[PDB]
């Protein structure tokens, strides 16, 4: 009997001061707000119903109307920022936090969900949820000896809401809130449900997207080996955030990068750098470029794991955005590597696919490649073998592309090409 009511009829029932009439009309609003297409969120807001729903959250003696209003407000808060703000403006944040302690699991779960939508809107509402004290009661719901005893749907919703408390920047979440959540997140990252694992990895990826000190708070909890394990999962929704987190970590110090290498991550890169999902190859190549920006002993582990041929492969054929990350990986490698390491790059076949990418109408990748060539020549100088390299560049059509770039518009580009020609080709 609560199917497809008009907003007018919902209002009439909610304004009746008969609690059971109010319950039926609130369920009718919940069903409207739950429909597949175009839920009438603005019309419900415009009818003035949010304050009434918020007061219903407080009706301990009518748990059904607490549930129905919590679900209705969850779905309003699922909308635009302005729609979420209307829920926050009605006083919903403290009312939902109070429902976290509900003895009815389905009501506590709905309050978890609503707070996830609020916090997920952005940094300010995230921080406002934290200031109203959401973290303690959320974490208390997970304080069980074995997460396997919780209902799977309930645990997934908690994990997702915690990941929204970790999400967003400018500012990043308060340091003390992150320290408070992290031990529970570490435990969720070891749980066996694929959706819990994915959202735990997303949360970790948000917390490592930041300066070195934020990375260190995570790395010090010892999660890198579990992240590397998940990097090999068969589920793409797990691999994607695990790889984003690993990539964020290797943007940190060389010691943080070494923990990634120590845990075995490089052995997964033959598959990641050939992965059929373009986004995975791109993120894996970006991650490789931050590893080849490391120490010579880290470059050497890239060599030992057989990854330079995989970088030649991606430079030769990949989505253009991936090829650009590969060009960066090569310039970083040639900037930091030993003479022997750089020589090895040439023996693996780097020169021809590098030259072919000089036809790209992207100015910064051209700058990147020209820098690499110069670095490779400098290594060749120290061995007295620049002429061998010049001929290599000439035989594959590279000298033509470099000469043509002397007449390229970008002054940084034509200066670099002029120097190369002047220095090694005449």
């Amino acid at each position: 009997g609560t199917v497809n009511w008009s907003v007018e009829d919902i209002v009439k029932g909610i304004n009746s001061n008969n609690l059971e009439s109010q319950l039926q009309a609130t369920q009718a609003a919940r069903k409207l707000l739950s429909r597949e297409k175009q839920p009438p969120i603005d019309n419900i807001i415009r009818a003035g119903l949010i304050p009434k729903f918020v007061s219903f959250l407080g009706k301990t003696d009518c748990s059904p109307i607490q549930f129905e209003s919590a679900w209705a407000l969850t779905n309003i808060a699922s909308g635009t920022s302005e729609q979420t703000k209307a829920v926050v403006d009605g006083g919903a944040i403290p009312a939902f936090i109070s429902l976290l302690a509900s003895p009815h699991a389905h009501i506590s779960e709905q309050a978890v969900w609503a707070l996830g939508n609020i916090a997920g809107d952005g940094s300010a509402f995230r921080d406002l949820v934290i200031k109203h004290g959401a973290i303690d009661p959320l974490l208390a719901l997970l304080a069980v000896p074995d997460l396997s005893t919780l209902a799977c749907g309930y645990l997934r919703n908690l994990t997702w809401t915690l990941s929204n408390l970790c999400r967003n920047k400018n500012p990043a979440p308060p340091l003390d809130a992150v320290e408070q959540i992290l031990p529970t997140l570490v435990r969720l990252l070891h749980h066996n449900d694929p959706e819990v694992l994915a959202d735990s990895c997303w949360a970790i990826s948000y917390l490592t997207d930041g300066p070195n000190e934020r990375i260190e708070m995570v790395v010090k909890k010892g999660v890198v080996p579990q992240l590397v394990k998940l990097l090999g999962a068969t589920e793409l929704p797990i691999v994607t955030p695990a790889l984003r987190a690993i990539g964020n970590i290797v943007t940190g110090t060389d010691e943080q990068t070494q923990k990634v290498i120590d845990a075995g991550a490089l052995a997964v890169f033959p598959s990641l750098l050939t992965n059929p999902k373009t986004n995975i190859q791109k993120e894996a190549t970006w991650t490789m470029s931050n590893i080849t920006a490391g120490r010579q002993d880290q470059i050497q582990q890239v060599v030992n794991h057989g990854l330079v041929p995989f970088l030649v492969g991606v430079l030769s054929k990949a989505d253009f955005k991936t090829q650009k990350e590969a060009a960066w990986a090569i310039t970083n490698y040639t900037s930091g590597g030993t003479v022997e390491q750089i020589v090895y790059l040439v023996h693996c076949g780097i020169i021809e696919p590098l030259m072919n990418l000089l036809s790209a109408k992207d100015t910064k990748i051209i700058q990147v490649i020209l820098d690499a060539i110069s670095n490779i020549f400098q290594a060749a100088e120290k061995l007295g073998e620049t002429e061998k390299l010049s001929i290599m560049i000439e035989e594959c059509g590279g000298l033509d592309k470099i000469e043509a770039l002397q007449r390229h518009e970008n002054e940084s580009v034509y200066k670099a090409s002029l120097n190369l020609i002047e220095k090694y080709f005449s």
Partner: peptide
């Protein structure tokens, strides 16, 4: 996704 609507 940042936000989720409960449909059922």
């Amino acid at each position: 996704g940042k936000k989720r609507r409960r449909e059922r």
